[PDB]
Design an enzyme around this catalytic site. Sequence first.
Site, PDB file in Angstrom:
ATOM      1  CB  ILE D 152      -0.951   0.016   1.207  1.00  0.00           C
ATOM      2  CG1 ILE D 152      -1.951  -1.153   1.068  1.00  0.00           C
ATOM      3  CG2 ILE D 152      -1.634   1.407   1.354  1.00  0.00           C
ATOM      4  CD1 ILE D 152      -2.766  -1.407   2.319  1.00  0.00           C
ATOM      5  CB  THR D 229      -4.993   4.261   5.709  1.00  0.00           C
ATOM      6  OG1 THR D 229      -3.655   4.303   5.134  1.00  0.00           O
ATOM      7  CG2 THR D 229      -5.769   5.585   5.348  1.00  0.00           C
ATOM      8  CB  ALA D 230      -1.222   1.799   9.249  1.00  0.00           C
ATOM      9  NE  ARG D 231      -4.979  -3.599  11.796  1.00  0.00           N
ATOM     10  CZ  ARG D 231      -5.450  -3.671  10.557  1.00  0.00           C
ATOM     11  NH1 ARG D 231      -5.504  -2.583   9.797  1.00  0.00           N
ATOM     12  NH2 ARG D 231      -5.846  -4.852  10.064  1.00  0.00           N
ATOM     13  CD  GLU D 260     -10.330   0.475  13.993  1.00  0.00           C
ATOM     14  OE1 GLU D 260      -9.515   1.390  13.662  1.00  0.00           O
ATOM     15  OE2 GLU D 260     -10.617  -0.518  13.289  1.00  0.00           O
ATOM     16  CG  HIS D 294     -10.736  -0.204   9.622  1.00  0.00           C
ATOM     17  ND1 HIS D 294      -9.999  -0.710  10.675  1.00  0.00           N
ATOM     18  CD2 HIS D 294     -10.178  -0.717   8.494  1.00  0.00           C
ATOM     19  CE1 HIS D 294      -9.031  -1.482  10.200  1.00  0.00           C
ATOM     20  NE2 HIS D 294      -9.130  -1.519   8.881  1.00  0.00           N
ATOM     21  CB  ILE D 295     -14.798   2.253   4.935  1.00  0.00           C
ATOM     22  CG1 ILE D 295     -14.849   3.749   5.203  1.00  0.00           C
ATOM     23  CG2 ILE D 295     -15.864   1.518   5.752  1.00  0.00           C
ATOM     24  CD1 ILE D 295     -13.905   4.581   4.297  1.00  0.00           C
ATOM     25  CB  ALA D 296      -8.835   2.702   3.652  1.00  0.00           C
TER      26      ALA D 296
HETATM   27  N1  LIG Z   1      -7.384   0.923   6.536  1.00  0.00           N
HETATM   28  C1  LIG Z   1      -7.627  -0.217   5.921  1.00  0.00           C
HETATM   29  O1  LIG Z   1      -8.832  -0.403   5.312  1.00  0.00           O
HETATM   30  C2  LIG Z   1      -6.613  -1.336   5.834  1.00  0.00           C
HETATM   31  C3  LIG Z   1      -6.718  -2.278   4.817  1.00  0.00           C
HETATM   32  C4  LIG Z   1      -5.615  -3.085   4.505  1.00  0.00           C
HETATM   33  C5  LIG Z   1      -4.451  -2.993   5.232  1.00  0.00           C
HETATM   34  N2  LIG Z   1      -4.358  -2.081   6.236  1.00  0.00           N
HETATM   35  C6  LIG Z   1      -3.150  -1.927   7.050  1.00  0.00           C
HETATM   36  O2  LIG Z   1      -1.991  -1.512   6.348  1.00  0.00           O
HETATM   37  C7  LIG Z   1      -0.881  -2.358   6.681  1.00  0.00           C
HETATM   38  C8  LIG Z   1       0.039  -2.370   5.477  1.00  0.00           C
HETATM   39  O3  LIG Z   1      -0.519  -3.154   4.450  1.00  0.00           O
HETATM   40  P1  LIG Z   1       0.436  -3.614   3.193  1.00  0.00           P
HETATM   41  O4  LIG Z   1      -0.396  -4.563   2.453  1.00  0.00           O
HETATM   42  O5  LIG Z   1       1.195  -2.429   2.688  1.00  0.00           O
HETATM   43  O6  LIG Z   1       1.478  -4.462   4.099  1.00  0.00           O
HETATM   44  P2  LIG Z   1       3.017  -4.749   3.685  1.00  0.00           P
HETATM   45  O7  LIG Z   1       3.415  -5.800   4.619  1.00  0.00           O
HETATM   46  O8  LIG Z   1       3.082  -4.997   2.245  1.00  0.00           O
HETATM   47  O9  LIG Z   1       3.846  -3.409   4.003  1.00  0.00           O
HETATM   48  C9  LIG Z   1       4.237  -3.159   5.333  1.00  0.00           C
HETATM   49  C10 LIG Z   1       5.572  -2.459   5.289  1.00  0.00           C
HETATM   50  O10 LIG Z   1       5.894  -2.029   6.581  1.00  0.00           O
HETATM   51  C11 LIG Z   1       7.261  -2.245   6.813  1.00  0.00           C
HETATM   52  N3  LIG Z   1       7.485  -2.340   8.253  1.00  0.00           N
HETATM   53  C12 LIG Z   1       6.993  -3.296   9.105  1.00  0.00           C
HETATM   54  N4  LIG Z   1       7.426  -2.994  10.356  1.00  0.00           N
HETATM   55  C13 LIG Z   1       8.169  -1.873  10.271  1.00  0.00           C
HETATM   56  C14 LIG Z   1       8.854  -1.171  11.235  1.00  0.00           C
HETATM   57  N5  LIG Z   1       8.993  -1.743  12.429  1.00  0.00           N
HETATM   58  N6  LIG Z   1       9.561  -0.036  10.891  1.00  0.00           N
HETATM   59  C15 LIG Z   1       9.575   0.376   9.566  1.00  0.00           C
HETATM   60  N7  LIG Z   1       8.894  -0.339   8.595  1.00  0.00           N
HETATM   61  C16 LIG Z   1       8.209  -1.450   8.962  1.00  0.00           C
HETATM   62  C17 LIG Z   1       7.610  -3.526   6.058  1.00  0.00           C
HETATM   63  O11 LIG Z   1       9.012  -3.575   5.839  1.00  0.00           O
HETATM   64  C18 LIG Z   1       6.740  -3.355   4.813  1.00  0.00           C
HETATM   65  O12 LIG Z   1       7.402  -2.632   3.795  1.00  0.00           O
HETATM   66  C19 LIG Z   1      -1.519  -3.689   7.051  1.00  0.00           C
HETATM   67  O13 LIG Z   1      -0.745  -4.542   7.897  1.00  0.00           O
HETATM   68  C20 LIG Z   1      -2.797  -3.237   7.745  1.00  0.00           C
HETATM   69  O14 LIG Z   1      -2.508  -2.965   9.112  1.00  0.00           O
HETATM   70  C21 LIG Z   1      -5.425  -1.244   6.535  1.00  0.00           C
END
Ligand SMILES: NC(=O)c1ccc[n+]([C@@H]2O[C@H](COP(=O)([O-])OP(=O)(O)OC[C@H]3O[C@@H](n4cnc5c(N)ncnc54)[C@H](O)[C@@H]3O)[C@@H](O)[C@H]2O)c1
Lengths: 333, 334, 334, 334
Positions: D152, D229-231, D260, D294-296
């Site tokens: 993402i 949009t992460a956690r 949330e 949480h609908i991204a």
């Molecule tokens: N808002 C939403 O609707 C929704 C939907 C999907 C995913 N997400 C969240 O987004 C996150 C990312 O999704 P993605 O598919 O890009 O995952 P991904 O695993 O492809 O990317 C995560 C990145 O974070 C990096 N990372 C992990 N820990 C780190 C740290 N300690 N310091 C620096 N970098 C670190 C990894 O190296 C990786 O590049 C998911 O785990 C989820 O929590 C949210």
Amino acid sequence: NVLFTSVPQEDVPFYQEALKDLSLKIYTTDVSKVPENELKKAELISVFVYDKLTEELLSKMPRLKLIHTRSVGFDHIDLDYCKKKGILVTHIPAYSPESVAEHTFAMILTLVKRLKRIEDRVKKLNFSQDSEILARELNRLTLGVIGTGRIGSRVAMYGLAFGMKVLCYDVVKREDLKEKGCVYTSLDELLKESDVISLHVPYTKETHHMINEERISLMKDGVYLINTARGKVVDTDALYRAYQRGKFSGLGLDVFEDEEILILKKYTEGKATDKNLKILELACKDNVIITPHIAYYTDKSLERIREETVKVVKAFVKGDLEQIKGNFVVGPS
Amino acid sequence: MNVLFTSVPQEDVPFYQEALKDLSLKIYTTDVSKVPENELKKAELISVFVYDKLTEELLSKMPRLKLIHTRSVGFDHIDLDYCKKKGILVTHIPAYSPESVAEHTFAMILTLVKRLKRIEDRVKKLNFSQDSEILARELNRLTLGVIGTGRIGSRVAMYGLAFGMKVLCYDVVKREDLKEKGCVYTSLDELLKESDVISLHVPYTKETHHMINEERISLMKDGVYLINTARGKVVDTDALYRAYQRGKFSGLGLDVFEDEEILILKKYTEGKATDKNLKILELACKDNVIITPHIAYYTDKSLERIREETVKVVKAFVKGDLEQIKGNFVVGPS
Amino acid sequence: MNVLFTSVPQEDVPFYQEALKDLSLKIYTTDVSKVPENELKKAELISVFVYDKLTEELLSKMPRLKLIHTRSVGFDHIDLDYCKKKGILVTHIPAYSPESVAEHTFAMILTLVKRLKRIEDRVKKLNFSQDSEILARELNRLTLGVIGTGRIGSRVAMYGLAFGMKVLCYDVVKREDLKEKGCVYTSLDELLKESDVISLHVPYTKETHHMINEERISLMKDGVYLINTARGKVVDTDALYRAYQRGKFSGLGLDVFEDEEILILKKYTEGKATDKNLKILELACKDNVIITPHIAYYTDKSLERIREETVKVVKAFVKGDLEQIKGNFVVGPS
Amino acid sequence: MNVLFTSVPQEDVPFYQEALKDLSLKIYTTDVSKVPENELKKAELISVFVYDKLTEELLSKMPRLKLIHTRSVGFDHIDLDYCKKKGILVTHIPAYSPESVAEHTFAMILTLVKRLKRIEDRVKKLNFSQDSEILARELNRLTLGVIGTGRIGSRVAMYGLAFGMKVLCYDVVKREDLKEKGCVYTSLDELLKESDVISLHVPYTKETHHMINEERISLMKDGVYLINTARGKVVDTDALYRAYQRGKFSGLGLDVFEDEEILILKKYTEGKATDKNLKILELACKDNVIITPHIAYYTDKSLERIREETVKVVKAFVKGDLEQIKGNFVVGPS
Ligand SMILES: NC(=O)c1ccc[n+]([C@@H]2O[C@H](COP(=O)([O-])OP(=O)(O)OC[C@H]3O[C@@H](n4cnc5c(N)ncnc54)[C@H](O)[C@@H]3O)[C@@H](O)[C@H]2O)c1
Ligand SMILES: NC(=O)c1ccc[n+]([C@@H]2O[C@H](COP(=O)([O-])OP(=O)(O)OC[C@H]3O[C@@H](n4cnc5c(N)ncnc54)[C@H](O)[C@@H]3O)[C@@H](O)[C@H]2O)c1
Ligand SMILES: NC(=O)c1ccc[n+]([C@@H]2O[C@H](COP(=O)([O-])OP(=O)(O)OC[C@H]3O[C@@H](n4cnc5c(N)ncnc54)[C@H](O)[C@@H]3O)[C@@H](O)[C@H]2O)c1
Ligand SMILES: NC(=O)c1ccc[n+]([C@@H]2O[C@H](COP(=O)([O-])OP(=O)(O)OC[C@H]3O[C@@H](n4cnc5c(N)ncnc54)[C@H](O)[C@@H]3O)[C@@H](O)[C@H]2O)c1
């Protein structure tokens, strides 16, 4: 041959059943959209306040004997024409004076207690208390009632019950109100001394724009002004200019000039005025309440308007005019 | 005498500073829980408002305290048994303006009955049409049930009568002055069953605690309007919420509610929150609910009178002229 | 020479007086129609903005006028035929920031496709649930139609390509740079029938007048999203409103619209109003419509660049240095 | 095989029943906490979503469990340590639609930088004027800081490059493809100090817990825009609230936030609530803040792909073809 115009959909079946013996055409639309072949045939038309019965329209109605308006007001009808052509006009003088008087007090209380501003704060999770929402009390205020008829006299009485000082202006000075504490005064004295002013006169040549630039300038800075009478009693342009200068603590308007354009969405057929935009702007302010001419619009009113309307129509087909003598605006001869 | 004021709006500080300038006076705009222990220890007279919680534990830290004055009608925030045990005098202000609250109560009733919130939503959307979603009712066709006919409730009953309402009344004291105007005193269950609009004007006590509960709500007419300008804990907010969601009410008007102080004083900035805060916030956005933040009393006249009566109590007490303020005692001498 | 500035924001007045202190300058915050005739007659260079109607009737009263500079991209508010026959030069600012408007277009497209306005209404009601009423679509699954691929529209087409959209392009002139990046130039009727999102970026001329009319809207897919940041009169507002009321659109984004100036300048305080004003106000309230007051251009960089280019043009013209502002001429010598 | 599905939307129920009718399938629309213990003990495969808390405690009640499938990218709701210790497999869906979240991210950025919420407020009040309170900024002048350049985050960086933004990046895993496009990796502290817009795209782990805290926020520019949009737990909500009230931010955009699930699943219906719920509710009402539930991810393509991948994972596991779903494993065989 009976013609009903501007009838809401849900009344359509009620009037068909109630008037089954008669030859009845009903339109949810207004009289200006009725085809000329139906206008020519009508012996009795029943309208509401947005059907403009001008000479031009009434000329297209050579068999017309009686116009019944399902309302207190009749300023939408050219009475002088009717008098000269021998057309009878009836109305419903008292289906529910209480509806409008209660609505008037709802607006006064809404404004003085600053409820709209409180509601805006609450929506922002602002539950604090400060001077922006510091209310006043009715018992410390003077109410000026312009027109003490069926509706206004009730407004005056609710005022008294709240401990307000009540001033009144009317050509007819009521004993019952005077005995209870109301004081009849000149217009200029009412305008100068009142904290809350409320209008309850019909629209006529004499009440046309009576609240104008000059009259507004006589009012107290911070007055509250309520209109539930007719829009054209107030010069909307003067009202708007005064509001913009901060003249009012609040405005409550259930009627206003060019209202029909908004209420009937005539802008879908090309109509609009500066007064429509002025009103829409005012409507957004936190010390202004605009309602779409619904002060009358209660369950009790609608039930009585039906009842009286059916009574007037049946009375007239039988020729029993004595039965409806209190309904006439333009009576025999 | 060492005088301590808490929960004083900043705008009132100048007034009390000048009026009480020849006393040893300390003023806080924050509440009593935030006052340093060294100030609490010295205080002989405290003046509080209704969010200053004077529990046993707090009062224990004020060993020199002789009088508590609350700038309010209500005194349920004060541990009176502790005060009586210890010989602490407690005053209040019984009647700065009963009209403020009675008027507010009717403002809410008329707002709801004329459906002004719904109409305002339509007007905002350029919807100036008329239809059954905004068809109003008339007060003069309705029965008002007033629970508590004291200073506030009796005025509410009289406003009801003046609108042509049938008025039913419930109180342990039956007032002949109200009977003679047309109010009919009934049992609680009869008032609940027959009223179209019910309004609460009783103090919070152990007896009125959740008086309006799941059972009593279910006795009400479907379509009832319920108004609360008394105290929040007089109504079970969990039961009110469940009932609202099943469509019990034509409208709700709440100036007071359980856990209100969390919202009103923003105590969530210090970690506080309850489920009732979230339930009230959800109800606040409905088009047939009016929520106001305990401001029924908050008029210019009330504020003037609260100032005047509070200054009179303090000056009386420092003088020892106790008979002058006899009407103010909740816990009186001695 | 005598320089006349109209519709200058009050915040810009000191700036221009200082930059052009060497000249004989008259600045007005009001529009040209409210300038006194004696000042209109003196004027040799006039700088205006897009609400100053430089009509033949108005330019009649400026016999000494040599140059009109509009502080804007658009020049449709200026009678160019009258200027041409009288030898009046006309300048504009073609590229203060096409990015400002193209970013705005995309903010509108994303707002609508992500249903942010509906989600916001839900959140304001403490409705945080998920259901099909806020189920979004993805841009990478959609076809964008860009009508006008000039400085603004070409950037819009490139943003769309970066989002993985299929991009269709329509313009009187084909650009190789866009074609090479993946835009497919097509006919207007193909773009209208195949696009899921259509965005407008043409100037207002006799040929673009009501280009988006009843017939062409009928060629669009049911559920199309339509964006206008070009000029109001490029769209027949009446046909738009009618189509909207029948459910034609998934969403509308209008930064410009017919009769906009009545609202933007509050001309209803002087008696003006049209039915298009009310139609737009009604549309503005819908949860799948976004209306903005002609502010796509209104960024800090835009305003800075407009100030700079304007003193540049004025100073170059008062010297004879026409080459320096070659790129600014809309109607050049001779 | 006994298969248990929790937190399934009602409209998905028939679909999974048809897809898996060759199996012993129990489907709940409620979360795992509300599933009877007898059913938890039978379950050989469990499929959950991000609000089902598979704590050691809950998992310890599931003796027969071989595989947990989460219909999500995220797995911070599963105690992975436990699963490894006990030999339980864990799958997820790593890439149903990274574009959904990346696009939502830019919808929020554009909303905030173009001040669309404040403009909408003005338009609602018939204020169509232009002044400094709605002066926007341009993305192409700004620096974007992407914390987390995974599926993402890498797309978000690419969109930023497409808008002409300088893009700074922070990740523990460097991606050469992003450097070759013009992204520049830096230290966290430098990204925090230099970025005008910051967006978070890390998973929730011990190492990311409150990554964005009082200290990190204080490093940001005054005027920064922050997106999440992460956690929710990657951000210290209390520090974020405190900074907001000090005027630290030009805008905030949060699709995820601590606690949330109380708002999203309406757990205040069952007595749950926290201060962070109230802080989020207050921030949601500001004109420079956008909160979404949480609908991204919540797009039609996402929902289709989550269905298909979940079916494949289940059908694979039952057939023993673990090689098929090799890409799905968070915790793979032995
Ligand atoms: N808002 C939403 O609707 C929704 C939907 C999907 C995913 N997400 C969240 O987004 C996150 C990312 O999704 P993605 O598919 O890009 O995952 P991904 O695993 O492809 O990317 C995560 C990145 O974070 C990096 N990372 C992990 N820990 C780190 C740290 N300690 N310091 C620096 N970098 C670190 C990894 O190296 C990786 O590049 C998911 O785990 C989820 O929590 C949210
Ligand atoms: N907003 C609404 O829903 C609604 C509903 C019903 C009636 N109305 C309006 O309210 C008006 C009043 O209704 P009502 O039933 O009280 O009427 P009414 O005839 O009983 O009372 C009008 C009063 O105004 C007085 N009056 C008339 N002209 C005057 C003048 N120039 N100077 C001083 N006094 C004058 C009369 O003497 C009378 O006392 C109606 O005519 C109608 O226009 C509005
Ligand atoms: N919302 C506000 O801003 C606001 C302002 C002032 C007062 N209040 C509240 O209103 C309450 C009433 O104020 P008031 O001035 O009318 O008080 P009051 O003492 O004059 O009236 C209380 C009445 O309640 C009756 N009552 C008490 N307990 C009862 C019970 N167990 N069952 C039946 N009847 C009972 C009493 O007989 C009395 O008639 C106050 O105690 C206070 O809590 C609220
Ligand atoms: N909303 C705003 O704040 C704002 C700001 C700046 C400009 N604008 C408007 O946007 C317009 C475009 O600006 P730009 O900088 O892209 O100008 P531009 O001159 O670079 O682009 C115009 C494009 O439209 C094409 N075109 C002209 N007539 C056409 C026709 N009849 N059919 C098809 N294509 C046609 C031209 O070939 C050209 O490629 C301006 O003229 C102005 O009306 C609006």
